[PDB]
Write a protein that binds this ligand. Structure first.
Ligand SMILES: N[C@@H](CCC(=O)N[C@@H](CSC(=S)NCCc1ccccc1)C(=O)NCC(=O)O)C(=O)O
Ligand SMILES: N[C@@H](CCC(=O)N[C@@H](CSC(=S)NCCc1ccccc1)C(=O)NCC(=O)O)C(=O)O
Ligand SMILES: N[C@@H](CCC(=O)N[C@@H](CS)C(=O)NCC(=O)O)C(=O)O
Ligand SMILES: [Ca+2]
Ligand SMILES: [Ca+2]
Ligand SMILES: [Ca+2]
Ligand SMILES: [Ca+2]
Ligand SMILES: [Ca+2]
Ligand SMILES: [Ca+2]
Ligand SMILES: [Ca+2]
Ligand SMILES: [Ca+2]
Lengths: 209, 209
């Protein structure tokens, strides 16, 4: 396969770029890193920022999940039609990353005490994406413009894991709800989402979701 | 001016994009939002993600500091020479963002008790950028390729504020040390760094640095 994903045995920060690769009909190898292998120390010391994922595209080696998304966006043409749309795509993805950071903080450092405060705050955090949809062809296509972008895959992942965290959290947002149904139904993506290599991984690395 | 920056009266997440604009000979307007105006709520409610900075380039309104950097990178030609370099620029900026998030967490939530632990870990956090320099023309040009990129401006800001937090922290890193001196001496940037509109703002908004 032309691509390699090196990551822990979780969906985590690779879920979106995997969806992107599958949906775009690309093949890739998964190199799995166990917690035991990681704690040995050598792989970690060879990573630019001491962390995974690590990504190989031919002889190009990348770290940083959003760097990989943007690289795939750039090279597969999933980055809007012009500089104006590209800025909007970035704006969406940066918003997705901000909420992803908050989600990761809850999961790994404060799940038990923090969950209901997080869920009470969640509608306010999702609304900006509903508003973006409302402003683009009535929410009937994609988050930016009329072609899919890397930001769509990242947003879709974020929505999917929040429905697991808080089932029904999207019920107050008709555009986001139809959007999730619509993108998920894209044939290659639907098949990937139902496959063992997706379904049989946990969302996070600590048993929580 | 063709650009407007709407922000709190701090350097914060606007320092890099201001350095970029100044160094690239651009003019721009500063629209300042006081804590009192922000508390009133109406401006905040109008912001896409409820936060600043807000950036205007003509009738294009952007939110998210790194979206603004990437936008200016794209439109002003500070994004590498090809697709591979663009990926590397992204990789650097995402690394800078990660450390900035840690820096901000320290400053605003845990400065008193957490500073010693932060400073101890700091060499491990700066080494990646030294390594990147060592692999690009002996560290004698820019963080990626032969021309300046938006990532350089963000890295430069990150380095400057860490020298204030922990004076001498760059002493162990020859290439980053020389890099800071070299970019700081670029004529338009040198002038900006010495101007009241930079010098008379605090780095952060809580009195700590
Ligand atoms: N900005 C980076 C973040 C990479 C990252 O957080 N990687 C994690 C895995 S990805 C993820 S969703 N993990 C949850 C957050 C976490 C961070 C650090 C330790 C444990 C959990 C990792 O490698 N941890 C091991 C280590 O730091 O030694 C990116 O987007 O790729
Ligand atoms: N990902 C965004 C982050 C924007 C951001 O954090 N804006 C802060 C200002 S920028 C900064 S460096 N502030 C320090 C961190 C902070 C965050 C939230 C509240 C207070 C301080 C803000 O608007 N706070 C007001 C509010 O949320 O009501 C970006 O990069 O632009
Ligand atoms: N063309 C330059 C830089 C431009 C660039 O990086 N473009 C990316 C920025 S992440 C993009 O959004 N391209 C979308 C488009 O061409 O519409 C290169 O290949 O280095
Ligand atoms: Ca495979
Ligand atoms: Ca396309
Ligand atoms: Ca609680
Ligand atoms: Ca429903
Ligand atoms: Ca001005
Ligand atoms: Ca250039
Ligand atoms: Ca301490
Ligand atoms: Ca020195």
């Amino acid at each position: 396969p032309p691509y390699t994903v090196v990551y822990f045995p979780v969906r985590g920060r690779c879920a979106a770029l995997r969806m992107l690769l599958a949906d775009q009909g690309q093949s890739w190898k998964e190199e799995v890193v166990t917690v035991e292998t990681w704690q040995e120390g050598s792989l970690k010391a060879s990573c630019l920022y001491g962390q995974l994922p690590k990504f190989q595209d031919g002889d190009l080696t990348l770290y940083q999940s959003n760097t990989i998304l943007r690289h795939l966006g750039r090279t597969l043409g999933l980055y809007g039609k012009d500089q104006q749309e590209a800025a909007l795509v970035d704006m969406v993805n940066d918003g997705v990353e901000d909420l992803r950071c908050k989600y990761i903080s809850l999961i790994y450092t404060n799940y038990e005490a923090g969950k209901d405060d997080y869920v009470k705050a969640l509608p306010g955090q999702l609304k900006p994406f509903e508003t973006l949809l409302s402003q683009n062809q009535g929410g009937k296509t994609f988050i930016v413009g009329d072609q899919i972008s890397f930001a769509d895959y990242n947003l879709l992942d974020l929505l999917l894991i929040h429905e697991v965290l808080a089932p029904g959290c999207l019920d107050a947002f008709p555009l986001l709800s139809a959007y999730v149904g619509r993108l998920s139904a894209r044939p290659k993506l639907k098949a990937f989402l139902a496959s063992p290599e997706y379904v049989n991984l946990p969302i996070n690395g600590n048993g929580k979701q």
